[PDB]
Amino acid sequence: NQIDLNVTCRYAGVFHVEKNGRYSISRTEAADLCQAFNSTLPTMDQMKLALSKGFETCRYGFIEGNVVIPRIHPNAICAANHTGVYILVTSNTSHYDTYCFNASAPPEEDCTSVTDLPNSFDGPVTITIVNRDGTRYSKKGEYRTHQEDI
Numbered sequence: 001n002q003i004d005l006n007v008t009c010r011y012a013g014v015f016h017v018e019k020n021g022r023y024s025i026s027r028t029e030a031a032d033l034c035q036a037f038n039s040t041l042p043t044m045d046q047m048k049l050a051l052s053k054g055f056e057t058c059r060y061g062f063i064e065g066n067v068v069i070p071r072i073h074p075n076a077i078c079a080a081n082h083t084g085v086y087i088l089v090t091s092n093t094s095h096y097d098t099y100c101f102n103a104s105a106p107p108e109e110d111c112t113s114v115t116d117l118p119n120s121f122d123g124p125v126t127i128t129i130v131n132r133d134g135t136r137y138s139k140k141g142e143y144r145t146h147q148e149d150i
């Protein structure tokens with residue numbers, strides 16, 4: 001009963017989270033996951049500011065209202081070579097990564113590790129935060145509030 005959460009640097013408070021390193025988060029689970037980080041789904045405006053500070057990924061993830069990929073550099077295999085906040089238009093499927101927004105983070109790039117999941121609740125799951133530099137933090141808990149997600 002274990003979940004890995006792979007997290008990025010924060011850019012103007014915005015970061016990316018993947019669950020178990022594969023697209024596997026629903027819209028409801030995404031909201032709950034950000035809540036566990038004392039964060040919210042980003043607005044489009046928040047994501048655009050993050051992009052302007054250096055944020056890009058090669059992964060679809062939820063924001064408020066849409067599923068997006070922030071892109072700075074054109075890459076043929078990431079968002080069909082687009083730059084900017086690329087919006088997913090057409091998909092059959094419902095499970096992606098998520099973005100989250102923490103208002104208390106620094107205003108620009110923060111590439112320090114994440115060392116806490118401050119708002120997880122009591123539960124039986126071993127939840128491990130995995131940073132890109134390999135640094136890990138684990139705790140026993142839960143964050144999913146919808147049964148359909150469990």
Ligand SMILES: COC(=O)CCN1CCc2cccc(N)c2C1
Nearest residue numbers: 006007008016057059130131132
């Ligand atoms: C930003 O989305 C990605 O970089 C997907 C690739 N995964 C690769 C695996 C991994 C492991 C720990 C932390 C992070 N951020 C990642 C990112």
